[PDB]
Amino acid sequence: GWNAYIDNLMADGTCQDAAIVGYKDSPSVWAAVPGKTFVNITPAEVGVLVGKDRSSGLTLGGQKCSVIRDSLLQEFSMDLRTKSAPTFNVTVTKTDKTLVLLMGKGGVHGGLINKKCYEMASHLRRSQ
Numbered sequence: 617g618w619n620a621y622i623d624n625l626m627a628d629g630t631c632q633d634a635a636i637v638g639y640k641d642s643p644s645v646w647a648a649v650p651g652k653t654f655v656n657i658t659p660a661e662v663g664v665l666v667g668k669d670r671s672s673g674l675t676l677g678g679q680k681c682s683v684i685r686d687s688l689l690q691e692f693s694m695d696l697r698t699k700s701a702p703t704f705n706v707t708v709t710k711t712d713k714t715l716v717l718l719m720g721k722g723g724v725h726g727g728l729i730n731k732k733c734y735e736m737a738s739h740l741r742r743s744q
Contacts (some may be wrong), residue, residue, distance in 0.1 A: 618647035625718060625736060630728060632704070633719035636740075639666050640713055653677040654717050665694070665708060665715060673699060676717065681706060684726075692737070695730055705729045709737035712744040 618636045625634040626649065635654030636646045643662035648655035656677030664674050665688065673682045673696075680699040688694040688710050696706040698719070705726035709716045716737045720729040 621716075621736060621740070622647045622649060625732060630721060630724050631718055631732070632721045633717075635715075635717040637662060637715040637717065638713055639710075639715055646714065653679045653719065657717075662715065666710070676706070691734070693730065693734060695726060697726075707733035709733045711737050711740045714740060714744075716740065 621636055622634050625631060633649050633652040633654050635648035635657065637657055638644050638646050639662050643659035645655060645657050648657070654677055661675055661677070670686055670689070673680055675681065681696040682699055683694065683696055685695040688708060692710040694708040696708070698704045698706060702722045704722060705720040705724065707718050707726070707730040716733055718729050718733040720726065
């Protein structure tokens with residue numbers, strides 16, 4: 617399920633990819649945008665995102681990214697940029713059970729992507 621939250625995240629047209637991914641015990645994509653990138657996120661990739669090691673970029677659905685700000689286990693958020701060709705702002709926010717991921721279209725503020733991701737995760741915490 618969880619397609620409602622994807623639809624909402626994608627509705628204003630500023631973003632090109634979004635996903636909800638469970639990370640407890642057996643990580644899995646609960647919902648994502650078909651034919652994009654996040655839908656291909658692997659449990660191993662999730663493992664890196666939530667791993668205790670915050671030193672060692674990373675990949676999301678195979679797509680190489682650069683970590684720009686990491687507070688995921690702290691904001692409970694992470695800001696990234698896709699590694700290039702035009703690059704895109706990506707934000708990952710961590711709820712009690714899920715990772716919420718959001719990728720902006722070219723020329724969209726990383727702050728907007730972060731805000732949209734942050735608030736959605738906040739919304740999701742209210743029912744978890």
